[PDB]
Design a protein around this ligand. Structure first.
Ligand SMILES: [Cl-]
Length: 128
């Protein structure tokens, strides 16, 4: 059945009260037949996301094969492509009280990748 969409990187900036999670693939988890926008035939990811609570957060994705960015803040569906570093989605929050609960289902070349989760500046910035 489904695999988990991997978390590649996370971080935060106290100065800007921002934080992020980057989802995508690396060397030990890039499935066979999956290509990015640096490649001749980038794989389409057909993505459905579902959003509950959302204060101050948004997902950023590559909306076409030229890497033009798209953004989404609420339940919806879209087409996304992997960046040249095999990133699929950047989930960003802005502000002290930023928080989002979400579910991602992404389909590529006969495989489903899922992620259920939360991001908040409070948690991601590592304080109590
Ligand atoms: Cl290629």
């Amino acid at each position: 059945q489904a695999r988990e969409l991997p978390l590649l990187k996370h971080g935060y900036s106290k100065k800007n009260m921002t934080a992020y999670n980057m989802f995508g693939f690396c060397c030990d988890n890039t499935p066979s037949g999956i290509f990015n926008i640096m490649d001749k035939k980038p794989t389409e990811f057909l993505v459905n996301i579902y959003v509950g609570d959302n204060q101050g957060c948004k997902f950023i994705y590559a909306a076409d094969t030229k890497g033009k960015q798209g953004e989404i803040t609420q339940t919806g569906s879209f087409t996304a492509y992997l960046s040249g570093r095999n990133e699929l989605l950047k989930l960003e929050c802005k502000g002290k009280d930023s928080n989002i609960d979400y579910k991602v289902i992404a389909y590529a070349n006969a495989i489903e990748y899922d992620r259920v989760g939360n991001l908040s500046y409070l948690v991601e910035s590592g304080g109590l």
